[PDB]
Amino acid sequence: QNNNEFKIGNRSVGYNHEPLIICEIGINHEGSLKTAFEMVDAAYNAGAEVVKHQTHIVEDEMSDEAKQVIPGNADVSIYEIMERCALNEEDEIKLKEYVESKGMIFISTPFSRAAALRLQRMDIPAYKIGSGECNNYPLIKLVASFGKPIILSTGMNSIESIKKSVEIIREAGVPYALLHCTNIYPTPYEDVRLGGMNDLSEAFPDAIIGLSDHTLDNYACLGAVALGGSILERHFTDRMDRPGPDIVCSMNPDTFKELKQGAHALKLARGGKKDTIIAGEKPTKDFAFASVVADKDIKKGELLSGDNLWVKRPGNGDFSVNEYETLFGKVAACNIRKGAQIKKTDIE
């Protein structure tokens, strides 16, 4: 499919690498640092490599009007949701320390210029841009200027729209990933359109391609690995009985383990060429291919024909079924017994 790669710290990312699962705890901690640590713990214990946060600073990321608009998966204002779940800088720093104290990579999504500038002071290894901010070219310009790689969610945007963000990233010269995404919480299967992944890499050949997902299970993310995705992102929780607008479409430690397992299998099985010769198939070839046999007794000097020849397993005959017809017209040099393979010495 392709050979693009870049590193997030020490982790190589790309088609020829192990697909990377981003556990976004996001606002699932409900603004509690203690809950965020329990979620980071569940992710460590499940084998996660990367915890992603959301860096919310309510005054810089929304104007007064956001206190009157309700998101689709909640019933209060988006302003109220972020004032309730936002971690301040002192605690977000503690989150990053904790995540790395558990051996894992911390990245986050900035929603504002102030949030973007806070993460650069923390010196995170790479930056996630969410689907809302995929058309936020002034913000993309700022993050790309930090010189880290950029993982850009691409939901709710067209190729034409994304191309303007991608020109900005290329200009800064940082490597980048494009994540196909659908921003309904949760997302019906029929709205995933995994074909959108091929569309994205056909439109931008230099990009790592993966999927951000908000369906109820793993099927979409597994399908994306089969298609060549290198990065899979689901929301993450320690347990499903947590409160919060994104908990519903999150994975828990067990389903992460399923996803990590399917991702590994499909990383091996995907791709390749039809025509490749698999050495392990040879004993099956040798016994199951057909060889040309006599279909009846054939007298010395009689002509071989489609009436006195046929084909039978196994494959060690002098003439393969591929050469069946080239024996027509040839003359019997011996008496040939019915059911015997046609040997070269059976014809003049």
* Rounded Cα distance, 262 and 204, in Å: 27
| 161-180 binders of a second copy (CB under 8 A) | 180
Q: Which of 33, 104, 122, 290 binds a second copy (CB under 8 A)?
A: 290
242: DSSP letter: -
| 236-255 binders of ligand MN9 (CB under 6 A) | 245-246
Indicate which of a second copy, ligand MN9, none lies near residue 184 (CB less than 5 to 8 Å, by partner kind).
a second copy
Q: How are beta strands 150-153 and 176-180 bridged, if at all? A: parallel
- Annotate each residue in 26-55 with x if it binds a second copy (CB under 8 A) or - if it does not, as one string: ------------------------------
* Rounded Cα distance, 213 and 225, in Å: 12
C-alpha to C-alpha distances, 93 to 34, 98, 123, nearest whole angstrom: 14, 9, 11
Cα 154 → chain centroid: 15
Residues whose CB falls within 8 Å of the CB of residue 291, separated by 6 or more in sequence, listed in order = 311, 312, 313, 314, 315, 316, 317, 318, 319, 320, 321, 341, 342
| 97-116 binders of a second copy (CB under 8 A) | 111-113
| 76-105 binders of ligand MN9 (CB under 6 A) | 81
Examine residue 314 and say whether the peptide bond preceding it is cis (omega within 30 degrees of 0).
Answer: yes
Q: With H, G, I as helix, E, B as strand and everything else as coil, classify residue 209.
A: strand
Q: Which of 247, 293, 298, 332 binds a second copy (CB under 8 A)?
A: 293
Nearer to a second copy, 269 or 331 (CB): 269
Q: How many amino acids of this chain bind a second copy (CB under 8 A)?
A: 96
* Residue 105, phi then psi, degrees to nearest 5: -95, 130
| 131-190 binders of ligand MN9 (CB under 6 A) | 131-132, 183, 185
Binding segment toward a second copy, per CB under 8 A, in 10-18, 22-30, 86-94, 284-292:
284-292
Q: Is 210 in the site for ligand MN9 (CB under 6 A)?
A: no
Q: How many amino acids of this chain bind ligand MN9 (CB under 6 A)?
A: 15
Interacting residue ranges for ligand MN9, rule: CB under 6 A: 26-27, 71, 73-74, 81, 130-132, 183, 185, 245-246, 284, 288
